[PDB]
Ligand binder design. Structure first.
Ligand SMILES: O=C(O)CO[C@@H]1[C@@H](n2cc(-c3cc(F)c(F)c(F)c3)nn2)[C@@H](O)[C@@H](CO)O[C@@H]1Sc1ccc(Cl)c(Cl)c1
Ligand SMILES: [Mg+2]
Length: 138
């Protein structure tokens, strides 16, 4: 039963075989959800479900370095729904993150910021209630 914006510490830094699991519920009338894997002031991986982009829903992913966003990657498979619970898993692999939502594979995002051990925190914000957020080594 946790506070949003929530900062999940990642005290090792990230590395391959780290699995982050987030459980929550999308608020009625949600506009946005964000997961930010932060490296200092940079964002190595931003995962941003958007509920109204010109009346469509789309997940936007990107990397922010020195205050500049890179090329956006989009996924229009959109498994989130206003008022419904969800489970997000982010798996860290050597070359990419894999994201799964409700046990369905959703997208892969290749690492652009490859100093993974400097990613020290995951911010979780937007229009959700959060039940739990944890990382585990597998
Ligand atoms: O200013 C804009 O309205 C929000 O800015 C977003 C930028 N953003 C959104 C948020 C954000 C913050 C929150 F508190 C939330 F709860 C949330 F769900 C999202 N933080 N940063 C990235 O999504 C970025 C991805 O490329 O997209 C834009 S910035 C941007 C604008 C144009 C281009 Cl093409 C690019 Cl590459 C980036
Ligand atoms: Mg599927």
């Amino acid at each position: 039963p946790l506070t949003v914006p929530y900062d999940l510490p990642l005290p090792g830094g990230v590395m391959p075989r780290m699995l982050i699991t987030i459980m929550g519920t999308v608020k009625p009338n949600a506009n946005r959800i964000v997961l930010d894997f932060r490296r200092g002031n940079d964002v190595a991986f931003h995962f941003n479900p958007r509920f109204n982009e010109n009346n469509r829903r789309v997940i936007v992913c990107n990397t922010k370095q020195d205050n500049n966003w890179g090329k956006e990657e989009r996924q229009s498979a959109f498994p989130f729904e206003s008022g419904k619970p969800f489970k997000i898993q982010v798996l860290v692999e050597a070359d990419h993150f894999k994201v799964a939502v409700n046990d369905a594979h959703l997208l892969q995002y290749n690492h652009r910021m490859k100093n993974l051990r400097e990613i020290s925190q995951l911010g979780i914000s937007g229009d959700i209630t959060l039940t739990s957020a944890n990382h585990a080594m597998i």
